Structure 1
Amino acid sequence: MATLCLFDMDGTLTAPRQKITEEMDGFLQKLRQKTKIGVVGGSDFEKLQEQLGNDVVEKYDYVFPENGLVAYKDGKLLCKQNIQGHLGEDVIQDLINYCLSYIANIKLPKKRGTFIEFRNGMLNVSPIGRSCSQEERIEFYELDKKEHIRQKFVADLRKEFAGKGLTFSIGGQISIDVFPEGWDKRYCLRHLEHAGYKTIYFFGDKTMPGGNDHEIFTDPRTVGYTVTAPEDTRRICEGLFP
């Protein structure tokens, strides 16, 4: 219990958007013997129960849903944080208002709804709306590649809100992610600083620079290990802890 194996949820412990296989769930309780285990993902405590199980807080020594902004230690809640509590209501409104007014001046073939999805760890801004069909989603992506609308919107966002502690990125085919600096998976690491672990082994699939693991994989405080699929994840752990 001097080590911690910090696993990522999708592409690592389960199949993307899927329920963990009973076998994998077995190996994680087998490894729990030699090291403390934990899960982190940009998924709320519910999706973590749909995929890992309602007893997720009991099957791990650390549960870090929403990249740790919501956190648990030893089955007992540790703390909770939100972008409204960090940035303040005023700045939250100044960002929303800028994005709303910006999206209103973009000429598209189609606009729909849910242009601003509010989450406790991030705002998901889409010029078309996250309620668009799949055909309409593609239409925007293809046109985005040629016209570079999302890229221009990211640039204006970084200039408007310069030195406000925010990170803007292009996310997927139609959206733009907004979150305070360091609120990626690396936020879960602040709940482990004073626990003093010799090594925190992190495990994830998006180690690519531009992925949702890169920052925690490249972070000094972790020994990153890239995994292609849950079968790979259990392999590496078999050697590290024989």
Structure 2
Amino acid sequence: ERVLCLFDVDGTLTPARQKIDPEVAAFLQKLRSRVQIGVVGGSDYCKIAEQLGDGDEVIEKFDYVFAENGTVQYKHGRLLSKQTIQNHLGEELLQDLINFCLSYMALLRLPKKRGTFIEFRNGMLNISPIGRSCTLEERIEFSELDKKEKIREKFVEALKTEFAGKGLRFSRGGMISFDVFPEGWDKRYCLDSLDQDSFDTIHFFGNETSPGGNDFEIFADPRTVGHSVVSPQDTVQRCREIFFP
């Protein structure tokens, strides 16, 4: 009788990068009367909290908050100790990756460069040829050039070949950047901790559950009952069907 409903955020509970619709938020608390609820998203905690409430409301509204794919975890209001990428990969491979990226970017000539070309996060390194500290206009300008020249795509091809067999994965999306993360540090990462919390059933809901999507792995994992949704309204409807028939 112990059930967790675990939700992707962008396009599953909220419009992408935007605040949750109050009506959806209301349903989630209603659902909470029957099951525990949780979110897992690739973004950092600050971004997730921003979309799901004011201040740190998110950690009171949800029983679990998994940011950066679960490498950061809040469980019933309490922050757990974080996993760092350097402990998993080791300093030598991490620095090999960093230096390859620095060397590669040094040779790229762009309309503009700024700063934060390599952002060190808990769950990944984010690599941006223009640099993350660029304005909106600068970002769009880079993006247009990127599509014409396949700048990020070529960089990722070179990276994958160089590190073949070494257990690194690379994101396929993004606008001015791409993600580098250890194999298994997709959304499945949060499942290891959840394994210990005595749930009879964990239902996962996501809008990117086809191959290539950032929900595919957690959706397909045998530890979850998987649900594919197309919008927050679809998500609410699915939960109504299953939990309030």
TM-score, L = length of structure 2:
0.87
Using the alignment, how far apart are the partners of 1:150 and 1:106 within structure 2?
A: 11
Query: Unaligned stretches of 5+ in structure 2?
Result: none
The AA in structure 1 aligned to 2:59 is: V
2:59 counterpart SS class: coil
Identify the range of structure 1 (66-75 vs 107-116) with the bigger mean alpha-carbon deviation.
Answer: 107-116
The AA in structure 2 aligned to 1:44 is: D
Using the alignment, how far apart are the partners of 2:179 and 2:19 within structure 1?
A: 26
Distance verdict in 2 for CA 1:60–1:91, change over 3 Å: same
Q: Report deviation, 1:40.
A: 0.9
The AA in structure 1 aligned to 2:220 is: T
Counterpart of 1:38?
38
Determine if contact 2:72/2:122 at 8 Å carries over to the other structure: no
Determine if contact 2:82/2:122 at 8 Å carries over to the other structure: no
Count of aligned pairs? 242
Using the alignment, how far apart are the partners of 1:109 and 1:119 within structure 2?
A: 27
1:39 counterpart SS class: strand
2:7 counterpart SS class: strand
Counterpart of 1:184?
186
Distance verdict in 2 for CA 1:22–1:221, change over 3 Å: same
Determine if contact 1:69/1:80 at 8 Å carries over to the other structure: yes
User: Structure 1 stretches (4+) deviating beyond 4 angstroms?
Assistant: 133-136
Determine if contact 2:11/2:231 at 8 Å carries over to the other structure: yes
Using the alignment, how far apart are the partners of 1:194 and 1:23 within structure 2?
A: 32
Query: Unaligned stretches of 5+ in structure 1?
Result: none
Q: Report deviation, 1:213.
A: 1.4
Residue 22 in 1 paired to residue 26 in 2?
A: no
Using the alignment, how far apart are the partners of 2:23 and 2:171 within structure 1?
A: 36
Using the alignment, how far apart are the partners of 2:48 and 2:128 within structure 1?
A: 25
Determine if contact 1:13/1:20 at 8 Å carries over to the other structure: yes
Counterpart of 2:154?
152
Using the alignment, how far apart are the partners of 1:151 and 1:220 within structure 2?
A: 32
Per-residue Cα deviation, 1:95-115 (whole angstroms, up to 9, x for no partner): 111101111112434433322
Using the alignment, how far apart are the partners of 2:60 and 2:171 within structure 1?
A: 35
Q: Report deviation, 1:135.
A: 4.9
Counterpart of 2:130?
128
Counterpart of 1:93?
95
Using the alignment, how far apart are the partners of 2:115 and 2:72 within structure 1?
A: 28
Match of 2:219 among 217, 221, 237: 217
Match of 2:200 among 178, 182, 198: 198
- Give the % identical residues: 67
Per-residue Cα deviation, 1:31-83 (whole angstroms, up to 9, x for no partner): 11222211111222222322223232222222212211011222223331121
Q: CA RMSD in A?
A: 2.2
Determine if contact 1:150/1:170 at 8 Å carries over to the other structure: no
Identify the range of structure 1 (17-26 vs 138-147) with the bigger mean alpha-carbon deviation.
Answer: 138-147
The AA in structure 1 aligned to 2:63 is: D
2:20 counterpart SS class: coil
